[PDB]
Structure formats: structure tokens, C-alpha cells
Amino acid sequence: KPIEIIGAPFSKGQPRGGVEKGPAALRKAGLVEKLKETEYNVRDHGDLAFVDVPNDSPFQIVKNPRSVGKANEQLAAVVAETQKNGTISVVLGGDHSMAIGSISGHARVHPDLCVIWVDAHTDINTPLTASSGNLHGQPVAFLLKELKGKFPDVPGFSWVTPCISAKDIVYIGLRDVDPGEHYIIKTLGIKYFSMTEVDKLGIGKVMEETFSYLLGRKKRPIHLSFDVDGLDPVFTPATGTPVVGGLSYREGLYITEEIYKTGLLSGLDIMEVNPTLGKTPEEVTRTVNTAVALTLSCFGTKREGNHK
Amino acid sequence: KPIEIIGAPFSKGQPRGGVEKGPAALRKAGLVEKLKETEYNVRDHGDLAFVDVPNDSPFQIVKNPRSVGKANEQLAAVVAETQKNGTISVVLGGDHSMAIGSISGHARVHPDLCVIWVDAHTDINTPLTASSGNLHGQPVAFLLKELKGKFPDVPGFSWVTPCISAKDIVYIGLRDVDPGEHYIIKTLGIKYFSMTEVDKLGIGKVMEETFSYLLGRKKRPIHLSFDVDGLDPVFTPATGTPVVGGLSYREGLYITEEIYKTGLLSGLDIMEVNPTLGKTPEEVTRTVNTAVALTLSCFGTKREGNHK
Amino acid sequence: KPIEIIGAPFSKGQPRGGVEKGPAALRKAGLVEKLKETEYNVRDHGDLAFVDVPNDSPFQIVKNPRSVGKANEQLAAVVAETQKNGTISVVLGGDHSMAIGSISGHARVHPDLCVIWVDAHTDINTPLTASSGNLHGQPVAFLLKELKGKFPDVPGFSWVTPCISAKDIVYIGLRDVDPGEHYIIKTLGIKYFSMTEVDKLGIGKVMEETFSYLLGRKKRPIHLSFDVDGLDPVFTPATGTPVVGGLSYREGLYITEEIYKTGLLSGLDIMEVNPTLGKTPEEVTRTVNTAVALTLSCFGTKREGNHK
Ligand SMILES: N[C@@H](CSCC[B-](O)(O)O)C(=O)O
Ligand SMILES: N[C@@H](CSCC[B-](O)(O)O)C(=O)O
Ligand SMILES: N[C@@H](CSCC[B-](O)(O)O)C(=O)O
Ligand SMILES: [Mn+2]
Ligand SMILES: [Mn+2]
Ligand SMILES: [Mn+2]
Ligand SMILES: [Mn+2]
Ligand SMILES: [Mn+2]
Ligand SMILES: [Mn+2]
Numbered sequence: 001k002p003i004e005i006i007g008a009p010f011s012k013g014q015p016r017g018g019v020e021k022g023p024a025a026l027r028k029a030g031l032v033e034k035l036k037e038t039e040y041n042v043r044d045h046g047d048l049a050f051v052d053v054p055n056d057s058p059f060q061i062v063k064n065p066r067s068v069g070k071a072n073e074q075l076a077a078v079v080a081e082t083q084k085n086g087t088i089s090v091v092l093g094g095d096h097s098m099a100i101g102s103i104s105g106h107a108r109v110h111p112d113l114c115v116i117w118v119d120a121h122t123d124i125n126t127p128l129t130a131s132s133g134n135l136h137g138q139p140v141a142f143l144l145k146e147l148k149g150k151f152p153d154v155p156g157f158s159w160v161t162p163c164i165s166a167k168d169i170v171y172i173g174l175r176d177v178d179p180g181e182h183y184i185i186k187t188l189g190i191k192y193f194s195m196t197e198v199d200k201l202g203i204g205k206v207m208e209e210t211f212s213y214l215l216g217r218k219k220r221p222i223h224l225s226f227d228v229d230g231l232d233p234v235f236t237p238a239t240g241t242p243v244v245g246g247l248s249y250r251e252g253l254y255i256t257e258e259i260y261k262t263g264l265l266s267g268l269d270i271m272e273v274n275p276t277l278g279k280t281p282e283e284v285t286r287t288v289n290t291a292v293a294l295t296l297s298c299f300g301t302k303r304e305g306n307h308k
Numbered sequence: 309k310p311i312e313i314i315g316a317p318f319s320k321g322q323p324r325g326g327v328e329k330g331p332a333a334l335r336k337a338g339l340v341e342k343l344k345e346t347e348y349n350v351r352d353h354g355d356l357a358f359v360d361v362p363n364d365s366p367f368q369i370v371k372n373p374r375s376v377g378k379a380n381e382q383l384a385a386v387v388a389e390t391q392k393n394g395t396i397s398v399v400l401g402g403d404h405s406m407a408i409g410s411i412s413g414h415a416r417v418h419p420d421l422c423v424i425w426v427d428a429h430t431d432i433n434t435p436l437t438a439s440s441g442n443l444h445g446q447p448v449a450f451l452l453k454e455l456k457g458k459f460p461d462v463p464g465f466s467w468v469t470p471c472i473s474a475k476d477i478v479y480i481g482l483r484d485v486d487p488g489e490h491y492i493i494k495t496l497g498i499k500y501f502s503m504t505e506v507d508k509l510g511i512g513k514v515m516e517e518t519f520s521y522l523l524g525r526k527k528r529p530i531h532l533s534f535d536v537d538g539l540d541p542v543f544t545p546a547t548g549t550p551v552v553g554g555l556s557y558r559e560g561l562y563i564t565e566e567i568y569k570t571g572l573l574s575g576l577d578i579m580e581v582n583p584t585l586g587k588t589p590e591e592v593t594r595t596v597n598t599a600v601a602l603t604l605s606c607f608g609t610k611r612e613g614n615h616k
Numbered sequence: 617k618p619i620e621i622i623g624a625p626f627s628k629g630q631p632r633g634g635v636e637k638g639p640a641a642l643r644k645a646g647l648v649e650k651l652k653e654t655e656y657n658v659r660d661h662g663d664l665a666f667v668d669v670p671n672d673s674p675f676q677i678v679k680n681p682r683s684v685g686k687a688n689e690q691l692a693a694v695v696a697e698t699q700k701n702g703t704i705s706v707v708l709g710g711d712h713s714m715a716i717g718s719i720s721g722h723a724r725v726h727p728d729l730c731v732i733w734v735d736a737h738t739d740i741n742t743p744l745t746a747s748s749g750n751l752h753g754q755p756v757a758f759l760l761k762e763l764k765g766k767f768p769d770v771p772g773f774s775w776v777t778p779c780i781s782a783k784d785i786v787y788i789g790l791r792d793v794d795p796g797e798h799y800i801i802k803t804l805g806i807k808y809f810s811m812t813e814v815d816k817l818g819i820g821k822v823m824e825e826t827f828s829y830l831l832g833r834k835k836r837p838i839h840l841s842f843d844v845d846g847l848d849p850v851f852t853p854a855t856g857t858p859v860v861g862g863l864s865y866r867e868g869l870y871i872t873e874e875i876y877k878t879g880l881l882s883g884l885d886i887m888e889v890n891p892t893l894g895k896t897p898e899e900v901t902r903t904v905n906t907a908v909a910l911t912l913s914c915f916g917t918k919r920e921g922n923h924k
Contacts, residue, residue, distance in 0.1 A: 175611040183615040186615070194613075195611045302810075305798030307795040502918075504869075507870040
């Protein structure tokens with residue numbers, strides 16, 4: 001089971017600096033060559049080439065609808081293709097709206113997969129509840145089966161097929177949820193471990209519960225969508241929406257180490273790394289180094305050491 | 309049900325005076341406006357006027373014994389008034405000596421109240437054991453029954469009536485306790501959770517035990533006195549007496565969230581916030597925001613999110 | 617039970633000159649004076665003068681054998697002498713290669729001693745498994761019985777006799793282990809607590825398990841060899857081999873507080889403080905003060921407070 005690195009230098013999902021530079025920033029640290037050092041074979045697919053949809057006027061409050069939908073449609077076909085080939089797709093991200101395509105592709109092949117979403121945010125606003133109108137804050141809304149039809153058809157997303165049930169997703173790291181989002185997750189019964197549950201339980205018990213809940217009855221593919229703002233700004237400063245009181249570098253690694261151990265990791269997303277938003281170059285260094293370390297962890301690197 | 313913001317720009321409890329600007333800084337951050345966005349209604353009693361006592365000769369070691377005792381005598385009067393109005397009192401103060409007026413006036417109405425003292429210090433020096441003479445380090449000493457008549461009656465504190473006992477206060481965050489203080493807390497059998505206990509049990513079990521101790525025989529009014537230096541200097545740098553290795557931002561919010569969950573919060577103190585002590589504007593903004601964040605949490609704001 | 621500080625200004629164990637200045641930096645932090653103020657009586661033996669060996673050329677790959685050996689031989693005899701008289705030895709070191717002499721000398725007076733190694737590294741590379749050739753990454757290999765006869769006897773170390781068995785040592789803080797080292801610790805079944813275990817169990821649980829393991833069968837003296845890089849670079853930045861995701865300040869203090877509480881503390885090493893590797897003078901003070909706080913903790917200072 002090899003690894004397939006897939007770059008997605010896209011930012012139309014949001015307004016900020018240059019999240020599209022995230023893939024280049026990550027490879028710069030030698031992420032690909034480092035991955036090849038694990039027991040996994042690795043293939044770099046390269047970065048996708050996105051072309052904007054000309055008259056991409058806002059659909060209500062939703063910005064760059066057609067462009068975001070066009071990019072994601074392309075990504076779903078690419079991820080789907082590497083999934084069918086029996087590989088572990090790794091999307092080096094731009095904004096988190098690319099999770100729509102990443103997960104849609106992964107789900108077309110492994111429909112029974114589950115999603116672990118590490119993020120300070122739920123990204124579950126619909127094109128109606130979100131005032132920002134930034135698609136990176138609505139990916140899960142476009143993917144959940146229960147919200148299907150709860151919002152008007154959005155131009156550019158007619159190819160999307162709600163692929164994940166509200167009970168197949170687990171949030172870890174929440175601390176910045178909008179009113180409408182908290183309503184949805186609450187009314188839909190979505191399982192989450194906010195920073196409050198993390199402080200109470202400890203990351204160790206959080207994983208046991210995350211796994212028993214998602215893998216208790218039957219085992220299935222795991223798709224970990226990782227937003228770097230999930231960890232605390234001290235560790236991942238170079239992101240568009242940083243929130244204090246985040247996951248520590250240690251807890252982040254624990255998460256991935258545990259996920260590795262399940263041997264079920266099937267899809268991975270490393271998103272929101274925006275090098276331009278570094279107050280100093282070192283802040284980018286920290287962000288990138290933290291992202292790379294997490295990525296390597298998902299693939300066997302253990303802090304206790306490794307040997308063949 | 310209602311909430312009343314009381315301002316206490318008093319700094320005679322310590323050699324630093326920037327702590328007087330605390331209320332204005334918090335108010336400038338939008339504390340008032342944010343509290344109204346909760347489930348509670350809010351009232352701003354405005355700031356108290358502290359008439360400074362002329363010939364305030366030092367009482368042996370104690371500094372400004374009359375000026376502090378008089379400022380607090382008012383606070384206690386103001387606080388006793390809002391408490392009878394059936395509202396939750398919240399004091400945005402300067403130094404922690406004002407805890408005397410806040411807690412005294414609060415208990416003046418609710419004598420069966422308990423106290424949760426979040427602080428890196430015990431602030432329980434008696435005018436005799438204290439070596440600094442700064443009253444912001446002796447408040448608990450002027451409030452505990454067991455310590456009454458155990459040190460020469462200081463001038464200006466005649467009006468104070470020992471309200472709490474040794475089994476009605478719980479310390480959280482201790483990491484710098486002078487010898488005479490450690491002697492008293494243990495001789496008196498005061499219940500506390502120093503950083504050592506927080507590290508071992510974990511903040512989750514820590515809150516579970518304080519609530520068990522203070523509210524075991526019965527549910528009663530809770531007074532939360534929050535010294536911003538209880539959180540590590542990384543989070544609350546703009547404060548008078550900072551000590552490394554304190555409670556984290558997450559643990560700080562955890563405490564306040566839990567106390568809100570009891571529905572017993574009756575009195576609140578947010579002290580020692582001093583903007584003039586911010587090495588860089590971002591340090592004052594960081595300190596202030598955490599103080600506001602801690603307050604909102606006390607009144608419902610949850611990290612998992614909120615909706616109407 | 618008295619205490620005797622022993623300076624070990626040596627650095628031929630690693631490539632970066634400067635750690636030789638560690639003992640002078642610690643005293644300059646008032647370590648000796650702060651120690652006398654606890655309940656223990658203190659004596660400072662001063663620093664040892666090492667004899668730079670002439671034709672000290674590499675031994676296949678290990679750098680400066682004769683220099684490190686003779687250096688360690690000197691310390692051993694000194695540590696043996698102080699231990700003999702019935703005092704607790706505190707070795708202020710240069711690089712961690714001096715642990716060979718600290719522990720060797722300690723074991724002559726207490727053959728049943730156990731060892732608690734706080735490090736980000738296992739320092740158990742052999743002259744054949746290592747590659748850096750630096751001996752500060754091999755002290756444990758020279759002390760373990762199970763490792764004798766697993767590599768060629770090094771020139772200048774024949775005075776050494778493996779003193780600890782694979783079951784008499786416990787590691788805490790591990791996060792940067794070499795493949796060869798990892799193979800060794802799993803092969804020999806050595807007990808350890810990588811940051812992974814600390815994240816999972818909590819430092820409180822880690823200490824209980826460490827004591828059950830080492831002091832379960834029977835009670836015996838404890839040797840605590842503390843590498844400052846065991847703590848996170850945020851607290852001990854001035855060290856040769858910094859590694860993110862380290863033990864926190866609070867955890868370092870919890871470890872040392874629990875050790876002190878056993879009453880069996882007999883030998884201690886405070887190593888790898890390089891005051892020249894500090895990118896800024898404050899980073900040197902920060903690392904020196906952290907190490908100092910750690911030591912005081914090892915001899916009674918508790919965050920809850922102290923009093924005669
Ligand atoms: N709930 C906010 C959050 S935007 C943050 C998005 B992301 O998690 O991807 O960084 C909104 O609708 O804009
Ligand atoms: N024990 C010290 C403590 S000063 C800290 C006061 B406060 O906790 O209110 O910041 C003294 O007597 O000044
Ligand atoms: N495994 C590395 C570790 S160097 C770290 C040495 B010390 O733990 O003493 O800081 C080597 O063989 O150089
Ligand atoms: Mn996010
Ligand atoms: Mn996101
Ligand atoms: Mn304090
Ligand atoms: Mn205080
Ligand atoms: Mn070491
Ligand atoms: Mn080390």
C-alpha cells in the first residue's frame with residue numbers, strides 16, 4: 001500500500017494571503033524525500049493545475065462558487081483514481097475547501113470510510129448560515145448526507161454527492177464554532193471532542209473514544225482531514241484563522257501515532273498552511289516543521305524510535 | 309440572574325499602579341458588550357471613586373493600611389447592594405486586596421458562600437508574617453475566621469467581618485507560597501490544588517474534587533476570585549507578580565466553564581490585570597483578551613460553541 | 617543527610633565547545649546559595665581540573681576516548697569519596713558523557729541503586745552503533761551489564777565496570793532515538809516513557825509506574841541523571857541537541873518533586889547546559905534558572921510551599 005502525494009495549491013476557498021503556497025512550503029522541507037524513508041513507497045503526483053471560472057459572481061453570500069467547485073471536482077477525480085489503485089492519498093493543501101473534493105473522491109471508492117476532522121473549526125456552515133461566505137468554512141456541509149437539500153443548489157457543485165453520514169465523522173480540537181454550526185452539530189448528533197473534552201479527558205482517552213465510536217462495530221477506512229489551525233498558534237502560527245487554546249504539538253503527534261497504529265489510514269489532508277501569514281520566517285518554519293512531523297507520524301514515525 | 313459590573317481601579321495594594329487602568333482596558337476590549345451577547349442581562353455600575361486617606365502612616369509592615377481598608381469598605385457596600393438586588397456581582401479591579409471588599413460585601417448578603425481562589429499565590433500573609441507589606445498579598449488573611457485575632461488589628465479594617473472559614477475556600481494554581489503562608493495553610497488545613505496537584509490529577513479531576521469539597525453537604529453561592537497571574541505568564545504577561553509554570557489558557561477556561569455549569573456563580577473577581585506592565589502592546593492585548601475570555605466563559609460562552 | 621556539589625567542566629564528549637561553562641553558569645544563578653536555604657546542609661567541592669590527553673585520536677569512530685575516559689575516571693573517584701562519607705552528590709556537568717563517572721562512582725558505594733534518566737535521548741549508542749562519534753550519546757552503553765561484550769573495549773575506559781542492569785533504569789522524555797538505540801532498548805526490554813507515554817498516561821501516572829517498576833521489589837538508592845534537553849526547548853533552549861515536544865516546566869518539576877518524596881535520592885547530574893549556545897543572553901538565564909529550579913525541587917522545594 002503506497003503513498004500518493006497530491007498538491008492542491010488553491011486558495012479561492014478563502015480571502016487571506018497565500019495558502020496556495022502551502023504545497024511548495026511543505027515540499028521545501030523535504031516532505032516527499034522524508035516520507036520515502038518510512039516503510040511506505042511514495043509517489044509525488046505533483047500539484048494540480050486550477051483554472052478559474054470567468055464570470056464567477058457570488059451566489060448569495062457564497063464567493064467563488066464555480067471556481068471552488070471546479071477545482072474540487074478535479075481533485076475528486078484524481079483522489080478517486082489513486083484510491084482505486086490501492087494507494088494512500090495525501091493532499092498537500094491550500095484552503096480546507098479542498099476537503100470536499102478529497103473526501104468525495106476517497107468516498108467514491110471506499111464509501112464506508114469514516115472521517116476524523118482535526119480543527120479548531122467545524123467547517124459545517126451551509127451557504128445560508130455562513131455570513132463570511134468563505135467555502136473553506138463549509139466543506140462538511142457539502143459532504144454530509146443529513147444536510148443534503150438544506151441549502152439551495154450552489155453553482156459549480158452539481159457533481160457532488162453527499163457521501164458521509166453525520167455518524168461517520170469525529171471532530172477533535174473545536175474551540176471556535178459559529179451559532180448556526182453549533183446548532184447543526186447539536187441537532188444532528190455529531191460526535192466531537194472540543195478543547196473542553198480534551199482538557200477533561202486527556203488526548204489518550206479521546207482517541208480510545210474516537211476509535212471505539214468509529215471502529216467499534218466494524219473496521220473501515222479512515223480519512224483524517226487535518227487543519228493546522230487545529231493545533232495552537234504557538235505551534236502552527238502561519239494559518240488564516242488561528243485560535244488560542246489549541247492542540248499541543250504533542251497531542252497532535254499522539255493523534256497521528258494512534259491513527260497510524262490502526263493500520264486503517266486511507267486518506268490524509270494537510271491544509272491551511274499559509275507561509276505568507278508568518279509574522280517572522282521562523283513562525284513559518286514552526287508551522288511547516290509541525291505539519292511535516294504530523295504527516296510522517298501518520299506513516300510510522302514514533303517518538304520512541306524506529307528500526308527495521 | 310442579572311449581572312452588575314463594578315469597577316475597582318485601586319492599586320494601593322501593591323507598589324505598581326498601572327493596575328488601576330485595568331477596568332478601562334477590559335471595558336475598551338468590549339467586555340461589557342460581549343457579556344450582553346450571553347444569556348444574561350448586564351448592568352454597568354460604573355467605576356468606584358476612591359478617596360485617598362491623608363496621613364496613612366504604615367502599620368508596622370503593612371503599607372497604605374487606611375487607604376486600602378477604606379476603598380474596600382466601599383466595595384463591600386456596593387457589592388452587598390447588588391447581591392441583595394439579586395444579581396451576580398462582577399468586579400473589574402486593580403490589585404487583589406480589593407478581594408476584601410468584594411468578598412466581604414458578597415458574604416454580607418450571602419454568609420454561606422464558598423470561595424474558589426485561582427492564583428499563583430495564597431495571598432494569605434498576616435500583617436505579621438508578610439515581609440512585603442503589600443496588602444494584595446494578605447486578602448485571604450483578613451477574610452478567614454481562623455486568622456481573626458491572630459495579628460494586631462490593622463487600622464481601617466475594623467469594618468471587616470471574618471466571613472469564610474478554612475473549609476469554604478479552595479485554592480487553584482499555587483506555585484509561589486512564602487514560608488509563613490505555607491505554615492498557615494497546612495496548620496489550618498486549608499484545601500488547595502497547587503500546580504503539583506493540577507499536574508498529577510489533571511484539571512478535570514481537580515474541578516471535580518473542589519466541587520465535591522465545597523458543595524458536598526449542599527449547593528451554595530460560589531465566589532470566584534480570579535488573579536490573572538494564576539495562568540502562566542505566556543498567557544497573562546501584563547500582571548504584577550508573574551511566576552513561570554502556571555495554569556494554561558485551556559485549563560483556565562476549563563475552570564470557568566465548569567463553574568458556569570454549576571449555576572451557582574454569585575460573585576466574581578478578575579484582578580491584577582495591569583496593561584502598563586505589557587512589554588509589548590501584544591502582551592497587554594493578550595493579557596486583556598484572556599481576562600475577557602475567562603469572564604464570558606463564567607457566563608455561558610462554551611468552546612464547543614453557543615447558539616440561541 | 618548532607619549535599620556536596622561537584623563541578624564537572626568537561627566538553628570533550630560532544631562537538632560544541634561551551635558546556636564546560638555550565639557549572640560556572642549554574643552557580644552564577646545562585647544554585648549553591650539557594651540550596652543552603654532548604655532543609656539540607658550544603659558543601660561545594662568546586663570544579664575538577666581535567667588533564668587533556670595528548671595523542672587522543674579517534675577509536676574507529678568514537679571521538680576523544682582517552683580524554684573522556686580519564687575525565688570520567690577522575691569524577692568517579694571524587695563521587696565515590698563524597699558518597700562514601702554519606703552525602704548526596706550533585707554533579708553540575710558539561711556534556712552527558714560525565715554520567716559514566718558520576719554513576720560509576722555512585723555505584724561503588726551503592727551497588728543496588730536504580731537510575732532515572734530524564735532525557736530526550738537514550739544515550740545508549742555503542743562505539744559501533746553510533747555514527748556521530750560523540751560520547752555524550754553513549755554513557756548508558758558503558759554502564760549497562762547487558763551491553764558489556766557487545767562492542768570493543770574502548771581505550772581509556774578499562775577502569776569501568778558495568779554497574780546497572782537493563783532492569784535498573786528508566787527513561788523519561790524520549791523523543792529522538794536512533795534506530796540502533798531503539799533496537800537495543802526493545803531487545804533488552806528496558807523500561808522507558810517516551811513523550812508518547814507521557815501524553816497518554818499523564819506525568820502523574822508515569823511517576824507511579826516508574827516507582828512501582830524500580831522500587832516495587834525492594835527500596836534502594838536513586839540516581840537521577842537529568843539532561844536539560846529533556847525539557848522542551850522553550851524552557852531549556854541553551855543545549856546542544858534541542859528537540860520540540862519536550863517535557864514541560866511543570867512536568868520537570870513534578871518528576872523531581874516525586875523523586876524527592878521517596879526519600880531515596882542519593883545521586884544527581886544536571887547536564888548539557890551550554891551557556892554559549894544561547895542565541896540570546898536571556899535564553900542562557902532561562903535554561904540556567906530552569907535547571908536550578910529543578911535541583912532545588914530534588915531537595916525539597918515544593919510548589920505548594922515550604923517552611924521550617
Ligand atoms: N465558521 C467560520 C470559520 S472559517 C475557518 C475555516 B477553516 O476551518 O477551514 O480554517 C466561517 O464560516 O467563516
Ligand atoms: N506573598 C507575596 C505575594 S505578592 C502577590 C499578590 B497577588 O497574588 O495578589 O498578586 C507578598 O506578600 O507580597
Ligand atoms: N543518538 C545521538 C544522540 S546525541 C544526544 C546526546 B545527549 O543525550 O547527551 O544530549 C548520537 O549518537 O549522537
Ligand atoms: Mn480551521
Ligand atoms: Mn478547516
Ligand atoms: Mn497572584
Ligand atoms: Mn492574588
Ligand atoms: Mn543526554
Ligand atoms: Mn539529550
